[PDB]
Design a protein around this ligand. Structure first.
Ligand SMILES: [Zn+2]
Length: 46
Protein backbone atom coordinates (compact mmCIF):
# COMPACT_ATOMS: atom_id res chain seq x y z
CA UNK A 1 0.00 0.00 0.00
CA UNK A 2 0.93 3.66 0.41
CA UNK A 3 3.44 4.55 3.12
CA UNK A 4 5.30 7.69 2.09
CA UNK A 5 4.47 10.72 -0.05
CA UNK A 6 7.62 12.56 -1.13
CA UNK A 7 10.72 10.51 -0.38
CA UNK A 8 11.93 10.00 3.18
CA UNK A 9 12.63 13.55 4.31
CA UNK A 10 15.54 15.20 2.54
CA UNK A 11 14.52 17.89 0.06
CA UNK A 12 16.07 16.53 -3.13
CA UNK A 13 15.07 18.13 -6.43
CA UNK A 14 15.31 15.99 -9.56
CA UNK A 15 15.67 17.28 -13.12
CA UNK A 16 12.54 16.67 -15.19
CA UNK A 17 14.82 16.85 -18.22
CA UNK A 18 17.42 14.17 -17.52
CA UNK A 19 16.49 13.08 -14.01
CA UNK A 20 19.50 14.24 -12.01
CA UNK A 21 18.82 14.55 -8.28
CA UNK A 22 20.31 17.65 -6.66
CA UNK A 23 20.56 18.33 -2.92
CA UNK A 24 20.18 22.04 -3.66
CA UNK A 25 17.23 23.87 -5.23
CA UNK A 26 19.50 26.66 -6.48
CA UNK A 27 22.13 24.28 -7.85
CA UNK A 28 19.59 22.37 -9.94
CA UNK A 29 17.99 25.50 -11.39
CA UNK A 30 21.47 26.24 -12.74
CA UNK A 31 21.87 22.73 -14.15
CA UNK A 32 18.50 22.69 -15.92
CA UNK A 33 19.92 25.60 -17.92
CA UNK A 34 22.00 23.03 -19.80
CA UNK A 35 18.78 21.56 -21.19
CA UNK A 36 17.30 24.90 -22.23
CA UNK A 37 20.60 25.92 -23.80
CA UNK A 38 19.97 24.91 -27.40
CA UNK A 39 19.69 26.69 -30.75
CA UNK A 40 17.59 29.89 -30.75
CA UNK A 41 13.98 28.74 -31.10
CA UNK A 42 12.36 32.16 -30.92
CA UNK A 43 13.64 34.96 -28.66
CA UNK A 44 11.83 38.21 -27.87
CA UNK A 45 12.41 41.83 -26.86
CA UNK A 46 12.91 40.84 -23.24
ZN1 LIG B 1 19.03 17.84 -16.35
Amino acid sequence: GSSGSSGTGGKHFECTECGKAFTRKSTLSMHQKIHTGEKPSGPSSG
